[PDB]
Amino acid sequence: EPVQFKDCGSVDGVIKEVNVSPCPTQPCQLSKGQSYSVNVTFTSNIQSKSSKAVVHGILMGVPVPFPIPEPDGCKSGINCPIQKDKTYSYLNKLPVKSEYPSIKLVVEWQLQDDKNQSLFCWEIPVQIVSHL
């Protein structure tokens, strides 16, 4: 479902939609040990040869770096090289582990380009919950 998001500064692109599945109610509830999919549709304002995805988990106003399995956006549903005015759908899917804490936080997702500038930057409220 399309979720509400705040744009944290997409300079070289315009976000069209942030779709998180499954997320019936917002802020998105993430059950532990369970995979969720993100699909970001955006329109690029420039031409770039690569794209590098960067994820942070913001707690108490401080971003905590979160490494993903694959940070390259060319292997994430984007046909590189990125062309101007074209529309793309970054795709990814991550599992919520049982090591993660049951906390509320703000997930921040960026996709940098050749000049290391944001093709998109968005943040959504997320709460990792326990299924027990």
Partner: protein
């Protein structure tokens, strides 16, 4: 003991459910009873203010609650003593709705202020982002066991009833002040008896 007439209200919320306060970013859930819902508290606050605005007529003069109530700090603090959970928020819609957080989660609101004030009701400042006082408007503390009912042990957050008490001065050497307070009590009884809100079950007692 005596020398104090009590105009009392017991308020419950039959069409309202319990809810859970979840602290940011994590922590133990804290349950909150039906009458401790924010909208219920706003409605109760406006009923209390309405009662404060009730005017009677005695001896060709108008009689308000301020003319018969217990105001221990007169004549510099003329606020009537009102024993109510709303006095933890100074009977203010603003203080009741006061909240702080980022743009996504609430760090502190009326839940945390309530949790603090029931443990230190005379505090002039909670130790949270709100910096709000716990003290009542009349300059004294409001003790939780006098304004809440139905809770378990000393977990005041599980209260299922609110008690709002207006103490007015009682006299045995001044029949005029007694009859004045009795006329105001008549107007108060009429008002509360003609107040119908499906979200609130109200029990009223005057000094008949």
């Amino acid at each position: 003991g005596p020398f104090f007439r009590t105009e009392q209200l017991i308020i419950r919320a039959p069409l309202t459910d319990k809810h859970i306060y979840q602290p940011y970013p994590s922590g133990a859930d804290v349950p909150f009873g039906p009458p401790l819902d924010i909208q219920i508290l706003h409605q109760v606050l406006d009923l209390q203010i309405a009662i404060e605005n009730i005017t009677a007529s005695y001896d060709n003069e108008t009689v308000t609650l301020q003319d018969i109530c217990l105001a221990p700090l007169s004549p510099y603090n003329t606020n009537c003593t009102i024993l109510s959970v709303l006095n933890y928020f100074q009977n203010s819609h603003s203080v009741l709705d006061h909240k702080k957080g980022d743009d996504f989660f609430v760090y502190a609101d009326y839940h945390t202020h309530f949790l603090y004030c029931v443990r230190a009701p005379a505090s002039l400042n909670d130790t949270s982002l709100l910096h709000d006082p716990c003290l009542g408007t009349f300059g004294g503390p409001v003790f939780p066991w006098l304004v809440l009912g139905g809770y378990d042990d000393q977990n005041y957050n599980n209260a299922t009833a609110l008690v709002i008490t207006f103490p007015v001065n009682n006299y045995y050497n001044d029949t005029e002040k007694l009859q004045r307070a009795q006329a105001w009590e008549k107007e108060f009884i009429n008002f509360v008896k003609n107040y119908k809100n499906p979200n609130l079950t109200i029990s009223f007692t005057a000094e008949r």
